[PDB]
């Protein structure tokens, strides 16, 4: 039992998480094979039982926390449903519950535990509360992309339990809305585009690609190391070696996430929740619940071309439920700073997340300024119009996006001020000084030309 | 020097604070004797010099913190003066500066230091920012008590420095607005009600009363003790003795504040800032800058009769700049809870202030419910109309307000969860259980009759 559990250099918790994630396929197959049920309560109870069983298997003494959390949530949502006080009360309650969880947890390296499922659950649930409050407004246009996306005040006595504890998107899965779940519940998501289809092209391809990334990461894992950053053995002697190591790093840690999300996607594609219609050619498209892009993620030089292709669901949720809801402050920068601060507090332990997200804001602002300036000058346009040879558009432009990505990703994997600063000072604070110089130089030359 | 500094059981810091507070009278006399100055910059420079000298005398390495704080404040107020972003930015900046100060300070017992002057300064300065933002609105009625109280957008290049560093109300003094300070600056506060008047009846009486309370407190100080609560020597054996001790306590700690505020009042009465007009009889009244009431403070049985007579200035400021500015949430209880939470965060170290203010909210709600129910019943009105003898209105009603006052004041002087809980459990959590029972009983009997 335990002899082979930790045999291949794996802890007791990572293997448990990976087997729990992989165990979603048989449940989806069982549900799809038995679809002749015409009563929704059976599906709801099945989802609740499967979610609770998975939570028990992962850790058997902490699921009652999330159970009482969702219980209190719909208990308080039943009363004062449309009141503006309700949304603020549920926001404060959920945020303080998560913050107390982090404060009393005090994890050190990763320590896979209840925190991730509770975090996903609470963000999805705050989204549900916002949607319910908005759905009680007047039926007019109101940014017409909302009526298809907002609940119509229907009773939610039991659907909230099954919606919260979905077996597919429980650990790190997507964060779909409420209306699509209700459409799935009583069997009208696909009349005949996807009853039998597909389970052949999309799901198998996604599973195979996830397995490919997983084997690549586990083959490249022992060769590289993370604690070598702290260690001083033949590291502080050369300079360019440190930059090259950080460049090679950062592009390898991210894969740790990638595989995971991809395999979760497969489960959804098997259920049918990913359907959103068909294109002009008439072929149905399933790229609606996707969390990553196949190709654009790793073949984009622009800084802003990654935040739109790394994780679609969380970024889209933040854009939808912060920017569109905080337009009464007359400054876009303040709204962006508030959104990034909220995203930092979402999973921020001590200091690494704050500095990482501040740095990210700095890159996005600098990139927007630079891209605005180019192709907007009487003289620089001709220089940029040189298209016979493009050395700048070549590898010269790249191998700098990855370097700053690793530079801003270092505080993410080391969130203690001592280790953070000790490993971050040896690179001479290159990114901050370089971007401060650039940010103070561009306005003057822009005014010059 | 130091032989007599600590001779009478006094630390090096309390004596410094008391001598600094008392040293305000000679400066006021010097200013009043030389009033023929027709230029405001001389008065402003005099106020700044006196305030900086007092700050240097109290502690000589930390005043630059407040100097840079006020500098940054009016630097950021110069730009985007009327923008809604400015008020939120200054609010966040001041609050986070004070919170960082408390977090990096980590005081234990009282440890008189920079924190109190910085706290008073930052609250006054946030008030100034709110006033400046409001003054840029339309000139209509707008709760007509505001035009006399709001600035009219006049330049504030130098008046902010003299206003912030007033020598009178610097440590624990009052928190007067901006317009009255400007009226005082160029000499039109009193044309001839108070050029020579008075400095005889008001100031001397206030000083004498403050000295009387001070000598009473210092005579009753060594007889009683505070650490006896922690000590178990012949304390945990009897029960009624603990309640009697807490009753006698609480009424003695408050005097520690009282004297202080009173003596500060004297300084203001000498300057002339306390004038607000005259009554119907024509005699001028100086009870405008007062921070305590002479008689109503200690001769009121009602719970709500103390929050309107303990400290007028801070309570009035909180009522003016929170309730009147947070009416867009449709629930009074939420506004009250937010105000009390802000007042707790104002000077809250770890836990005692939060529980103290929550308890205070509970008493005020319970008292309002009880006073609403009485004299509002078909049958209980006759019982309450018995006026031949009033044992209830006698000492029976009192000796219970003081007891709950001490019960809710215990966590204020012991703000560490260990000592707090250890001294608070021995009284069997009497207040919380009694008021929970009363709060759950009154609605049913109210519906009954
Ligand atoms: C290379 C760049 C980044 C490099 C990475 C650096 C650090 C990396 C940090 C973490 C990476 C490491 C591990 C990540 C993996 C797992 C950890 C979880 C963390 C994440 O996985 S997270 C990754 C980044 N995480 C973000 O979070 C960044 C993006 N997050 C945003 O939020 C963005 O900002 C975005 C792109 C969504 C918005 O970008 P945008 O600015 O282009 O949006 P846009 O302007 O196009 O929209 C126009 C609409 O603004 C509204 N509008 C106008 N004026 C307004 C005003 N005055 N006030 C308010 N609203 C206003 C109008 O209503 C209009 O609406 P309409 O369309 O109808 O006109
Ligand atoms: C015995 C009771 C307390 C016992 C003490 C227990 C614990 C003691 C705690 C500390 C004591 C120890 C040491 C203290 C010494 C130094 C430490 C510093 C701490 C202090 O030194 S601190 C002491 C207490 N510290 C407080 O802080 C309590 C009071 N602090 C408040 O804030 C109160 O609450 C108050 C009385 C000021 C307000 O009392 P209130 O409720 O009677 O006011 P009211 O109703 O009369 O005003 C009607 C107006 O509400 C507005 N309005 C209506 N509906 C609304 C809605 N839906 N939303 C928003 N606004 C609405 C309308 O606009 C209307 O305006 P209009 O007049 O035009 O009609
Ligand atoms: C614009 C912001 C300016 C930043 C403000 C700077 C605050 C730091 C200032 C003064 C602290 C002096 C402390 C007095 C003593 C307290 C000790 C303490 O407790 O402190 C510890 C350290 C000092 O070491 P030690 O004396 O104990 O050495 C002892 C030897 N040994 C190394 C073996 C441990 O103090 C430190 O250095 C603290 C190092 C950093 C800690 C906080 C992280 C800063 C966060 C930056 C991100 C802000 C972005 C916000 C906006 C986000 C938008 C998305
Ligand atoms: C409605 C609110 C419900 C309250 C939530 C309760 C949270 C407490 C819960 C669970 C904590 C279990 C902890 C697991 C271990 C972590 C240790 C820790 O770090 O914790 C320490 C203590 C436990 O002692 P130990 O194991 O270390 O003993 C060791 C032996 N020895 C005594 C020598 C030190 O944990 C404690 O007991 C904590 C005691 C209290 C600390 C926070 C104070 C509560 C605040 C209440 C006011 C809320 C009002 C808000 C609204 C304001 C409106 C104006």
Author numbering:
A (entry chain A), B (entry chain B): 42 to 490
Question: What did the article's authors report about this structure?
Answer:
The re-acylation is catalyzed by lysophosphatidylcholine acyltransferase (LPCAT) and among the four LPCAT members in human, the LPCAT3 preferentially introduces polyunsaturated acyl onto the sn-2 position of lysophosphatidylcholine, thereby modulating the membrane fluidity and membrane protein functions therein. Combining the x-ray crystallography and the cryo-electron microscopy, we determined the structures of LPCAT3 in apo-, acyl donor-bound, and acyl receptor-bound states. A reaction chamber was revealed in the LPCAT3 structure where the lysophosphatidylcholine and arachidonoyl-CoA were positioned in two tunnels connected near to the catalytic center. The structural and functional analysis provides the basis for the re-acylation of lysophosphatidylcholine and the substrate preference during the reactions.
After solubilization with LMNG, the oligomeric LPCAT3 was further separated from its monomers by size-exclusion chromatography in glyco-diosgenin (GDN) supplemented with 0.2 mM arachidonoyl CoA. The 3D refinement using C2 symmetry generated an EM density map with an overall resolution of 3.49 Å and a resolution of about 3 Å at the core region of cLPCAT3 protomers. The cytoplasmic end of the vertical tunnel is lined with positively charged amino acids and thereby provides a docking surface for the coenzyme A moiety, where the binding of CoA is stabilized by the electrostatic interactions among the pyrophosphate section of CoA and basic residues R409, as well as K365, 368, and 373. The araCoA extends into the T-shape chamber and turns at the joint point near H388 to a “side pocket” with its double-bonds in the acyl chain, and the carbonyl oxygen of the arachidonoyl pointing to the conserved residue N352, implying its role as protonation reagent in the hydrolysis of thioester bond. When N352 was mutated, the cLPCAT3 show an impaired acyltransferase activity, confirming its critical role in the reaction. To hold the acyl chain, the side pocket is in general lined with hydrophobic residues, e.g., F344, I348, I404, M446, and L450, and the functional assay showed that the mutations on those sites could reduce the enzymatic activities to various degrees. Unexpectedly, the E401A mutation fully abolished the acyltransferase activity, implying the importance of E401 in maintaining the binding of the acyl-CoA molecule. The cryo-EM map analysis on cLPCAT3/araCoA revealed the non-protein electron density sandwiched by cLPCAT3 protomers and two 1,2-dioleoyl-sn-glycero-3-phosphocholine (DOPC) molecules were well modeled into the large blobs of electron density. This non-contact dimerization might be mediated by those intermediary lipid molecules and the relatively harsh detergents used in the crystallization trial deprived the cLPCAT3 of the lipids bound, resulting in the monomeric biological unit in cLPCAT3 crystals.
